[PDB]
Amino acid sequence: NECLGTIGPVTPLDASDFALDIRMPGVTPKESDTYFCMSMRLPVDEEAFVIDFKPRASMDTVHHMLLFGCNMPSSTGSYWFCDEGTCTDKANILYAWARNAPPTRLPKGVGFRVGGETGSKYFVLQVHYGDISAFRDNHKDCSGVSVHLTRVPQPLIAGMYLMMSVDTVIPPGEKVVNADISCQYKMYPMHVFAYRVHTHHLGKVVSGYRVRNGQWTLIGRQNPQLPQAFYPVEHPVDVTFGDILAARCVFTGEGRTETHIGGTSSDEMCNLYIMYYMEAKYALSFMTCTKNVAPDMFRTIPAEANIPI
Ligand SMILES: [Cu+2]
Ligand SMILES: [Cu+2]
Ligand SMILES: [Cu+2]
């Protein structure tokens, strides 16, 4: 969007609410495929709730944008290159915008709990400039996100469920290898409202289900070779004590002359982010599954999970 000026990024809306305008401080990227970051310090030393995101992306030039909660940004400058990365501590993804992709909205009563003793103190924005054919120096970009914070305790708290395989091995050629992930859900109910799949250049399809009394209910199916936005769940799925979260990333060997789990694009990653909410009295902000606790259960995984789209 047009560049802010002197107006200031923090806007008080009342004694409970404030708005943050988190924007690049007028940047001009010189190479194609540049990653710019900046960070805003939360202006309250206490528990706040993030209850709305509005993207302020130039349709011309911004490919994807990521907003993260952490306590320690990588750099301290007004903006910096983040091929390096985002936060020194754990980066808690809050919001992922991609150019052409359905724009998910937070369900009524939902907040991301930030600040206080335990929450994030810092928002880190990350902007992917793609084709730099618009950036004929002819402009300075101020793309970013608007964020509505309240100190009012929200009845529903958002969280992030990450499922990643960490022992996977793809020999070269081997037309199909399956990374299977599965954990038994032991917490109070979560309502899954969005997912994001992330593989590197090998993965062909990634699929996530809740399985209850042997019934496979789809959470998401995506080609991981697309813009990695949070896609919206076709039917919001509850997950309950006794359920199994199961995921499968499907990988090809074809193309490789030597793969394992690592951070290098030469390495692979089978990741599924399930964004969810819980009742506030029960809410956990993060859960992880790195095991495969029920491998004999993938025997009845739906056909759809083994085929591209
Ligand atoms: Cu991008
Ligand atoms: Cu329900
Ligand atoms: Cu990766």
XYZ file of C-alpha atoms and ligand atoms in Angstrom:
312
model
C 0.000 0.000 0.000
C 1.076 3.726 -0.370
C 3.912 4.690 2.062
C 2.826 5.669 5.650
C 4.891 8.875 6.284
C 5.017 10.329 9.879
C 1.545 8.921 10.968
C 3.208 6.245 13.225
C 2.528 2.454 13.188
C 0.810 1.930 16.661
C -2.818 3.257 16.741
C -4.761 3.121 20.078
C -8.500 2.323 19.461
C -9.484 2.359 23.214
C -8.102 1.217 26.635
C -8.421 -2.475 25.502
C -7.613 -2.387 21.729
C -4.796 -0.962 19.534
C -3.922 -1.475 15.815
C -0.351 -2.171 14.543
C 0.607 -1.239 10.925
C 3.652 -3.551 10.282
C 5.133 -2.393 6.937
C 8.511 -2.416 5.129
C 10.085 1.051 5.672
C 10.074 1.816 1.899
C 12.389 -0.832 0.333
C 13.640 -1.361 -3.277
C 14.911 -4.924 -3.991
C 17.659 -5.158 -6.699
C 17.678 -8.987 -7.401
C 14.711 -11.308 -8.246
C 13.468 -13.544 -5.333
C 14.554 -11.252 -2.392
C 13.406 -11.916 1.251
C 13.087 -8.674 3.349
C 12.295 -8.792 7.130
C 11.501 -6.149 9.763
C 10.179 -6.443 13.390
C 7.753 -4.437 15.612
C 8.087 -4.538 19.442
C 4.675 -5.147 21.081
C 3.735 -1.845 22.824
C 2.323 -3.577 26.005
C 4.406 -5.590 28.564
C 1.364 -7.894 29.160
C -0.869 -10.629 27.603
C -2.603 -9.275 24.426
C -4.730 -11.115 21.781
C -4.287 -10.786 17.973
C -7.910 -10.881 16.665
C -7.575 -9.738 12.978
C -5.038 -9.558 10.086
C -5.479 -7.291 7.003
C -2.800 -7.770 4.282
C -1.374 -4.560 2.711
C 0.494 -6.292 -0.186
C 1.309 -4.665 -3.563
C -0.382 -7.057 -6.115
C 2.338 -5.796 -8.543
C 5.363 -7.133 -6.650
C 4.828 -9.124 -3.345
C 4.665 -12.955 -3.863
C 4.027 -14.085 -0.209
C 4.198 -12.505 3.313
C 4.695 -14.283 6.677
C 4.031 -12.816 10.159
C 5.847 -14.520 13.098
C 5.799 -14.147 16.905
C 9.141 -14.481 18.743
C 11.190 -12.796 21.535
C 14.527 -12.404 19.605
C 14.541 -11.170 15.964
C 17.701 -12.194 13.954
C 18.682 -8.510 13.311
C 17.960 -5.088 14.954
C 17.903 -2.892 11.774
C 14.792 -1.106 10.315
C 14.807 -3.890 7.621
C 17.281 -6.725 6.747
C 17.770 -9.720 4.333
C 16.331 -13.005 5.834
C 17.617 -15.804 3.595
C 19.563 -15.966 6.942
C 16.174 -16.491 8.717
C 13.659 -14.757 10.976
C 14.156 -15.201 14.806
C 17.151 -16.581 16.834
C 14.590 -18.245 19.231
C 11.555 -20.358 18.007
C 9.569 -18.411 15.316
C 5.792 -18.855 15.963
C 4.009 -18.425 12.595
C 0.785 -16.316 12.978
C -0.234 -15.391 9.398
C 0.816 -16.466 5.849
C -0.442 -14.467 2.805
C 0.246 -15.762 -0.774
C -0.480 -13.813 -4.026
C -3.239 -16.024 -5.604
C -4.798 -18.202 -2.824
C -8.048 -18.067 -0.754
C -7.585 -15.556 2.143
C -8.613 -17.469 5.357
C -10.203 -15.353 8.172
C -10.069 -15.954 11.986
C -13.308 -17.514 13.313
C -15.432 -15.305 15.649
C -13.906 -15.107 19.195
C -10.346 -16.283 18.204
C -7.039 -14.651 19.298
C -3.306 -15.431 19.105
C -2.111 -14.909 22.730
C 1.114 -12.762 22.669
C 3.059 -10.852 25.366
C 3.059 -11.310 29.167
C 5.545 -13.635 30.977
C 5.383 -16.317 28.196
C 3.965 -14.823 24.905
C 5.957 -13.237 22.002
C 7.237 -9.632 22.547
C 7.997 -9.078 18.808
C 6.258 -9.441 15.422
C 8.719 -10.256 12.565
C 7.282 -9.610 9.060
C 8.898 -11.462 6.100
C 8.086 -10.317 2.513
C 8.993 -12.314 -0.663
C 9.535 -9.925 -3.616
C 9.387 -12.110 -6.755
C 9.606 -10.608 -10.271
C 11.443 -7.272 -9.665
C 10.331 -5.920 -13.117
C 8.030 -3.444 -11.250
C 11.044 -2.233 -9.155
C 12.484 -0.076 -11.974
C 13.848 1.917 -8.954
C 10.628 3.817 -9.916
C 9.231 2.873 -6.406
C 9.931 2.150 -2.704
C 7.687 -0.640 -1.275
C 5.784 -0.370 2.066
C 3.975 -3.781 1.889
C 2.973 -5.518 5.152
C 0.115 -6.416 7.534
C -2.404 -4.573 9.705
C -2.984 -6.284 13.093
C -5.812 -5.684 15.663
C -4.642 -6.421 19.284
C -6.921 -6.398 22.387
C -6.080 -6.875 26.122
C -9.651 -8.396 26.404
C -9.287 -12.183 27.071
C -10.712 -13.894 23.931
C -13.010 -16.923 24.520
C -11.087 -18.958 21.843
C -7.235 -19.103 21.595
C -5.462 -19.976 18.299
C -2.511 -22.389 18.283
C -0.215 -24.206 15.815
C 0.049 -28.044 15.526
C 3.292 -28.982 13.624
C 3.740 -32.548 12.224
C 7.230 -33.276 10.752
C 9.058 -36.539 9.798
C 12.712 -36.505 11.052
C 14.114 -40.031 10.122
C 13.003 -40.150 6.393
C 15.563 -41.365 3.706
C 14.992 -41.162 -0.153
C 17.394 -43.321 -2.267
C 17.935 -41.894 -5.813
C 15.221 -42.801 -8.405
C 12.962 -44.823 -5.964
C 9.820 -43.428 -7.711
C 7.784 -43.266 -4.410
C 8.805 -43.039 -0.694
C 6.168 -42.282 2.043
C 7.025 -40.126 5.100
C 4.264 -41.163 7.579
C 3.618 -39.144 10.811
C 1.073 -40.146 13.523
C 0.400 -39.205 17.202
C -2.494 -39.903 19.608
C -4.200 -36.591 20.582
C -4.507 -36.519 24.436
C -5.631 -32.834 25.016
C -9.054 -31.076 25.307
C -10.771 -30.395 21.946
C -9.122 -28.356 19.156
C -11.000 -27.062 16.069
C -8.767 -27.205 12.947
C -9.601 -24.206 10.648
C -6.443 -24.034 8.401
C -3.303 -26.017 7.275
C 0.015 -25.271 5.466
C 2.196 -28.013 3.848
C 5.969 -27.495 3.285
C 8.243 -29.903 1.360
C 11.279 -29.046 -0.907
C 11.574 -29.918 -4.660
C 11.030 -33.752 -4.269
C 7.633 -34.047 -2.445
C 4.612 -34.641 -4.753
C 1.610 -34.574 -2.306
C 1.115 -33.986 1.500
C -2.121 -35.058 3.299
C -3.337 -34.751 6.931
C -6.278 -36.591 8.558
C -7.972 -37.035 11.899
C -8.678 -40.807 12.364
C -11.380 -41.762 14.939
C -12.800 -45.314 15.308
C -10.900 -46.132 12.040
C -12.665 -43.286 10.096
C -10.289 -41.025 8.047
C -11.531 -37.362 7.988
C -9.452 -35.102 5.644
C -7.887 -31.955 7.191
C -5.899 -30.966 4.058
C -4.375 -32.284 0.791
C -1.936 -29.984 -1.107
C 0.717 -30.026 -3.861
C 3.681 -28.709 -1.813
C 5.234 -27.213 -5.073
C 2.846 -24.169 -4.845
C 2.893 -20.865 -2.848
C 2.946 -22.133 0.806
C -0.024 -20.147 2.235
C -2.324 -21.348 5.013
C -5.225 -22.851 2.960
C -8.692 -22.839 4.614
C -10.144 -26.214 5.808
C -13.116 -27.344 3.589
C -15.026 -28.468 6.792
C -13.679 -27.211 10.196
C -12.654 -30.496 11.986
C -12.643 -30.940 15.818
C -9.878 -33.222 17.260
C -10.608 -34.959 20.573
C -9.039 -37.221 23.262
C -8.436 -40.633 21.641
C -8.199 -39.362 18.000
C -5.065 -39.974 15.870
C -3.583 -37.200 13.733
C -2.020 -38.992 10.699
C -0.078 -37.326 7.835
C 1.743 -38.655 4.736
C 4.229 -36.765 2.506
C 4.808 -38.642 -0.812
C 8.371 -38.225 -2.258
C 10.101 -39.081 -5.616
C 13.792 -40.087 -5.980
C 13.792 -39.290 -9.752
C 16.071 -36.221 -10.266
C 18.590 -37.016 -7.451
C 22.181 -38.250 -8.109
C 22.869 -38.933 -4.341
C 18.367 -37.270 0.418
C 17.723 -36.983 4.241
C 15.907 -34.529 6.664
C 17.710 -31.118 6.929
C 17.331 -27.338 6.266
C 19.270 -27.243 2.901
C 17.035 -27.216 -0.261
C 19.459 -30.113 -1.124
C 17.836 -31.774 1.978
C 14.071 -32.515 2.423
C 11.394 -31.594 5.019
C 7.927 -33.204 5.477
C 6.049 -30.480 7.486
C 2.263 -29.958 8.043
C 1.145 -26.825 10.023
C -2.451 -27.225 11.387
C -3.736 -23.860 12.724
C -6.515 -24.472 15.301
C -8.383 -22.890 18.240
C -9.368 -24.241 21.721
C -11.551 -22.936 24.613
C -9.335 -20.370 26.501
C -9.444 -22.408 29.787
C -7.842 -25.373 27.872
C -5.771 -23.636 25.142
C -2.139 -24.608 24.263
C -0.415 -22.322 21.684
C 1.877 -25.088 20.216
C 1.840 -28.889 19.874
C 4.262 -31.169 17.953
C 4.277 -34.699 16.522
C 7.653 -36.100 15.310
C 6.804 -39.831 16.015
C 4.888 -42.429 13.920
C 2.984 -44.212 16.776
C 0.486 -46.165 14.553
C 2.248 -47.360 11.332
C -0.115 -50.398 10.754
C -3.033 -47.856 10.577
C -1.792 -46.240 7.297
C -3.007 -49.591 5.799
C -6.525 -48.024 5.428
C -5.298 -44.482 4.385
C -7.616 -43.150 1.594
C -6.424 -43.763 -2.026
C -6.570 -39.959 -2.638
C -3.426 -39.582 -0.384
C -1.174 -41.615 -2.799
C -2.019 -39.589 -5.975
C -1.242 -36.003 -7.090
C -4.088 -33.481 -7.906
Cu 7.150 -16.238 -1.999
Cu -17.491 -29.509 16.299
Cu 12.102 -26.735 4.344
